[PDB]
Amino acid sequence: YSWTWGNXXXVXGX
Amino acid sequence: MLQCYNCPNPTADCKTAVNCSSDFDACLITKAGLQVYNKCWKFEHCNFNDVTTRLRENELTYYCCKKDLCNFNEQLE
Amino acid sequence: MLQCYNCPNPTADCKTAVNCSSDFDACLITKAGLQVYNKCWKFEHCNFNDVTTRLRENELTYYCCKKDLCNFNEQL
Ligand SMILES: [Zn+2]
């Protein structure tokens, strides 16, 4: 639950 | 063009690969509960808000990328 | 209230913890080349485009979250 990760790319999320 | 796993309906393991049309610049995958979606998508609109509303879902994790066939299930743990 | 690591300038290891004002709802961390940023931030604006333009950086990875002191370097 709510976090974001990313690049480019690349996106990674909650 | 960009090639994504893209299943009209949620599937436990989609292996249907398409050339997404030019309008779509990314491949999505997302688990919402036990349900799994694999789609041609737009990077701008890859985030919790855009994905939840567009797929009518409350709670999910998502991944998006721009390499061919990158939206496979093991991308989410 | 939200507590983030927040260093006015990029540092290899930011140890400054701040009470972000209520205008900020997230903690960011991003590696841009060898540089590392740790900031109070807004979730709306946590994405490649918003982060690169707001920090004047070409290539980076970023992570945002909302728990106290969550934006530490091992998150990437
Ligand atoms: Zn730089």
Numbering used by the authors:
A (entry chain G): 2 to 15
B (entry chain A): 0 to 76
C (entry chain C): 0 to 75
Sentences reproduced from the published study:
CD59 is a cell surface protein that plays an important role in mediating human health and disease. In contrast to its role inhibiting MAC pores, CD59 may be hijacked by cholesterol‐dependent cytolysins secreted by Gram‐positive bacterial pathogens, which use CD59 as a receptor on human cells to promote oligomerization of toxins at the membrane.
Crystals of CP‐06 in complex with the ectodomain of CD59 diffracted to 2.4 Å, and the structure was solved by molecular replacement. In the crystal structure, two CD59 molecules sandwich a single macrocyclic peptide, with three sets of complexes in the asymmetric unit. Together they create a large antiparallel intermolecular β‐sheet, in which the two copies of CD59 are oriented in opposite directions. The unique geometry of the d‐Tyr1 within the cyclic peptide facilitates the β‐turn at the tip of the hairpin, consistent with a known role for d‐amino acids in structuring short β‐hairpins. Furthermore, the cross‐strand pairing of Trp3 with Gly13 also likely contributes to peptide secondary structure, while Asn7, Arg8 of the GNR motif, and Ser9 form the second β‐turn of the cyclic peptide. Despite an extensive H‐bond network with backbone atoms, there are no hydrogen bonds between side‐chain atoms of CD59 and CP‐06. Instead, side‐chain interactions are dominated by hydrophobic contacts involving CD59:F47, T60, L59, Y61, Y62, and F42. Specifically, the CD59:Y62 side chain intercalates between the peptide Trp3 and Trp5 residues and explains the significant reduction in binding when either peptide residue is substituted for Ala. Despite a lack of sequence homology between CP‐06 and the β‐hairpin binding motifs of C8α and ILYd4, CD59 residues CD59:F47, CD59:Y61, CD59:Y62, and CD59:E58, which dominate the CP‐06 interface, contribute to both MAC and bacterial toxin binding modes.
